[PDB]
Design a protein around this ligand. Sequence first.
Ligand SMILES: CC(=O)N[C@@H]1[C@@H](O)[C@@H](F)[C@@](OP(=O)(O)OC[C@H]2O[C@@H](n3ccc(N)nc3=O)[C@H](O)[C@@H]2O)(C(=O)O)O[C@H]1[C@H](O)[C@H](O)CO
Length: 378
Amino acid sequence: MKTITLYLDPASLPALNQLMDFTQNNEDKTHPRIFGLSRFKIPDNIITQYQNIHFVELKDNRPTEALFTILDQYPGNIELNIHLNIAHSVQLIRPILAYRFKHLDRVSIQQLNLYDDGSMEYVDLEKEENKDISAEIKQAEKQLSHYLLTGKIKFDNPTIARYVWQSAFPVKYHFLSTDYFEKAEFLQPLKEYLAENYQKMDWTAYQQLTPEQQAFYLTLVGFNDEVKQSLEVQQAKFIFTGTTTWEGNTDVREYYAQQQLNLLNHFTQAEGDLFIGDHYKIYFKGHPRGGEINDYILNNAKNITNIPANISFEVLMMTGLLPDKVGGVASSLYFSLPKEKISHIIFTSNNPYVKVMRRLGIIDESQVIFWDSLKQLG
Ligand SMILES: CC(=O)N[C@@H]1[C@@H](O)[C@@H](F)[C@@](OP(=O)(O)OC[C@H]2O[C@@H](n3ccc(N)nc3=O)[C@H](O)[C@@H]2O)(C(=O)O)O[C@H]1[C@H](O)[C@H](O)CO
């Protein structure tokens, strides 16, 4: 009798897509919505415009028990419209399925919309190169049935399991690279299975919105006039892109900071192996979770312009503000960049990430550079 919409993501790229869906549907002010986005905070003056709007924390890649308190407020027949991170889909839906068990008479799942975490899904798929993919799919379907019927998780192939939701629900997949599913010949049985249930992430969606909706969207993603003006400068531009480590430990985080600064110097100094030229204006776009690694760059480099780390690179493409050249450590941002704009991509210290980028033609056949092979300058 009533639809409720849920938006869930611990990372960056699925949340960016989901905030576009919310913008497209923003005229309806009373439609029930539940936001679980770890990296995005919806501004207060947008929140006040809406009724039946809710928020939930994620812990260990799943909504917390606070979800159940929200759902208890809707005592009629309810249908759930769910948006999810692909790599983390099994854990993110876990508490939703548990609630459904308790209220079988009134709670149903209407549909799923799923979006890539990023490079993770592709590096993971590359590791499956030698397997019988057709057989893997049939087994994953069986094991998904057990999850839906019992509530217990056990998959022989956690990677392939991410792609079999259509056997239970109406679904739509949104991929960072549809080309990968064409070019990886071993994956043909998966492409065939998915049929009409997938599309590429649509980076032209912003252009189709009204002026009012475009402003609404830029507010959601943290884009502001000051950043816009810094990129409208009349000079050739280079953006240095940063990385992070999910290692908590001090020793590794400090090493990443040191090697990343040395890498910057190889682009910007005359004696550097990757010298771009004296005529470029230099920018820094740190990783959203770089933390102290980002601070090390700003503290120890000179003549560099910061772009706030929380702003997703892809927003620059949407707004038509891409620079001449882009360089740094391998990132998901490089998957949707025009090839003319790539300077050098460096890998961290046969490598599956290297293989993925080679298949897609993002890098060529020449020997790749790992950052521990670079001379310590100065
Ligand atoms: C293989 C693997 O594990 N890939 C994951 C990936 O699926 C995803 F979890 C993420 O993707 P990652 O490639 O870092 O980049 C994801 C998105 O973050 C924004 N971005 C990133 C870097 C930057 N300098 N400016 C930006 O704006 C862009 O919107 C981009 O599309 C992530 O944390 O979201 O982190 C990586 C790695 O764990 C990480 O790179 C550390 O090695």
